[PDB]
C-alpha cells in the first residue's frame, strides 16, 4: 500500500498504468479528425 498521506490517490493510481495505451488510441482519434491523411 501507499504511504498514508497519499492514500487519497489510490484510485487514481489504479488507473495510471493504462495511460500509455491511451496515447496509441489518441493517434487514431487524431487521424480520424484529419481523415487518415
Amino acid at each position: 500500500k501507499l504511504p498514508e498521506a497519499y492514500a487519497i490517490f489510490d484510485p487514481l493510481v489504479d488507473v495510471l498504468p493504462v495511460i500509455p495505451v491511451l496515447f496509441l488510441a489518441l493517434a487514431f482519434v487524431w487521424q480520424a479528425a484529419v481523415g487518415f491523411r
Binding site: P11, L12, D14, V15, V18, I19, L22, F23, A25, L26, V29, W30, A33, V34
Partner: peptide
C-alpha cells in the same frame, strides 16, 4: 470512484483534438 478519474483522464485526449479542430488548428 476509479471510474471517475479514468473518465477525467480518458476525456483529456479527445478534448485536445476538439479544441484544435474548432479553432482550426495545426492538426
Amino acid at each position: 470512484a476509479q471510474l471517475t478519474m479514468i473518465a477525467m483522464i480518458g476525456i483529456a485526449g479527445p478534448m485536445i483534438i476538439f479544441l484544435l479542430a474548432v479553432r482550426r488548428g495545426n492538426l
